[PDB]
Design a protein around this nucleic acid. Structure first.
Ligand SMILES: [Cl-]
Ligand SMILES: [Cl-]
Ligand SMILES: [Cl-]
Ligand SMILES: [Cl-]
Ligand SMILES: [Cl-]
Ligand SMILES: [Cl-]
Ligand SMILES: [Cl-]
Ligand SMILES: [Cl-]
Length: 302
RNA sequence: AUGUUUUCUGGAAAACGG
RNA sequence: GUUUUCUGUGAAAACGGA
C-alpha cells in the first residue's frame, strides 16, 4: 500500500511507550520509599516486553516475531490481572465452592485418595455397576475409616469422576482410566478446569497442598496445568477474568480491556501463519500497549 | 543460570511376525 | 511391521538464583 509507513510509525510509537515500562522506576510499585520502588512487572512480563521491543519492524521476519510477542505478552497480562485481583485469603473457599456448585466434592487428600482407590477396587476389572451400588460399595468401606464421609458426599466424588468423563444408570470405567495413576490424573485435571472456569489462578505448589496436603506433587500438578494449555487458552482466560472481576464488582473497569485482549488472542501464533499486514501490525501493537498500560496502572493503584 | 521442573517434539537394543 | 527395555535433539512454559 502507501499507508505501510504510517502503520509502521504508529506501531513503533506503541513499542516505544511499552519500552518505557522496562526503565528502572517507570513501573515502580510505589514511590513513597526506596524499599518499594521494585517494578510491578513480573519476570515473565519483563522478558516478554524485551522480546517485543527487540523486534525489527522494518523487516518481514521482525513483524512476524512482533505479532507472536504481542500475543505472548497479552496472554501473560490476563494471568497477571487475575493474580493481582485475586484474594489469597478467599482462594480455597472460592475453589471448593466452585466444585460443590457443580454437585462435585473433594473430601480431602487422604479421604479422596481412598474413595478413588475404592472406586477402582469395584470397577478396575471392567464391571458395570449402577451408581447406587458403586456408591454403597465405597461408603461401606470408607465410612468406618473416615466417619466424616457419607453416602451423599461419596455420591459427589462419583459425580466428579462422571463430569471428568471417566465413565462409559450403569457406570463402567473407560479402559484408559482403570489404573489409579490415570484415574487420579483425570480427576485432578477436572478440578483444575473447574478452578480455571471460576476465574481462579493457582500455582503448582498450592495445588499440591490443596489436593495432596504436601509439596511432593508439584511437578504432577504442573504437568496437568500444561496439558490443559491450548491455542484457545488465551481467549477462554479472558472470559475467566470476567468471572473473577464480577466476584467483586470491577471498580477499576478492567473489563474495558476485553476487546483488546480478544484481538490479541485471535493472533495466529503458528510459524505457518502469514505475515501480518501493516494494519494488523498496528492494531496488534495498539492492543498490547493498551493492556500492559492497563496492568501497570491497575497494580500501581490497587 | 553449566539452577529446578513441565509441555510438545526423533534413535538404539531385545523378542516376535511375515 | 508388533510388543518390550533404554535413550536423542530441538522449540516452548512455569518456578527461580533476586
Ligand atoms: Cl524497526
Ligand atoms: Cl526481529
Ligand atoms: Cl478473589
Ligand atoms: Cl463451578
Ligand atoms: Cl469440595
Ligand atoms: Cl482427608
Ligand atoms: Cl503443603
Ligand atoms: Cl514435585
Amino acid at each position: 500500500g502507501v499507508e505501510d509507513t504510517k502503520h509502521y510509525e504508529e506501531a513503533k510509537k506503541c513499542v516505544e511507550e511499552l519500552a518505557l515500562y522496562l526503565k528502572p522506576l517507570s513501573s515502580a510499585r510505589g514511590v513513597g520509599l526506596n524499599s518499594t520502588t521494585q517494578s510491578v512487572l513480573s519476570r515473565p512480563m519483563q522478558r516478554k516486553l524485551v522480546t517485543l521491543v527487540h523486534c525489527q519492524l522494518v523487516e518481514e521476519e521482525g513483524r512476524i516475531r512482533a505479532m507472536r510477542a504481542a500475543r505472548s505478552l497479552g496472554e501473560r497480562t490476563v494471568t497477571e490481572l487475575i493474580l493481582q485481583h485475586q484474594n489469597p485469603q478467599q482462594l480455597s473457599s472460592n475453589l471448593w465452592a466452585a466444585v460443590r456448585a457443580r454437585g462435585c466434592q473433594f473430601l480431602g487428600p487422604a479421604m479422596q485418595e481412598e474413595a478413588l482407590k475404592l472406586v477402582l477396587l469395584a470397577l478396575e476389572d471392567g464391571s458395570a455397576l449402577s451408581r447406587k451400588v458403586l456408591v454403597l460399595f465405597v461408603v461401606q468401606r470408607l465410612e468406618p475409616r473416615f466417619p466424616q464421609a457419607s453416602k451423599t458426599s461419596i455420591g459427589h466424588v462419583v459425580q466428579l469422576l462422571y463430569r471428568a468423563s471417566c465413565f462409559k444408570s450403569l457406570m463402567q470405567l473407560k479402559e484408559e482410566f482403570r489404573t489409579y495413576e490415570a484415574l487420579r490424573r483425570e480427576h485432578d485435571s477436572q478440578i483444575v478446569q473447574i478452578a480455571m472456569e471460576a476465574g481462579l489462578r493457582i500455582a503448582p505448589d498450592q495445588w499440591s497442598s490443596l489436593l495432596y496436603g504436601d509439596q511432593s506433587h508439584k511437578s504432577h500438578m504442573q504437568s496437568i496445568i500444561d496439558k490443559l494449555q491450548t491455542p484457545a487458552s488465551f481467549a477462554q482466560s479472558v472470559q475467566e477474568l470476567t468471572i473473577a472481576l464480577q466476584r467483586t464488582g470491577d471498580p477499576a473497569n478492567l473489563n474495558r480491556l476485553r476487546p483488546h485482549l480478544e484481538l490479541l488472542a485471535n493472533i495466529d501464533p503458528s510459524p505457518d501463519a502469514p505475515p501480518p499486514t501493516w494494519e494488523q501490525l498496528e492494531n496488534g501493537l495498539v492492543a498490547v500497549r493498551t493492556v500492559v498500560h492497563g496492568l501497570v496502572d491497575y497494580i500501581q493503584n490497587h
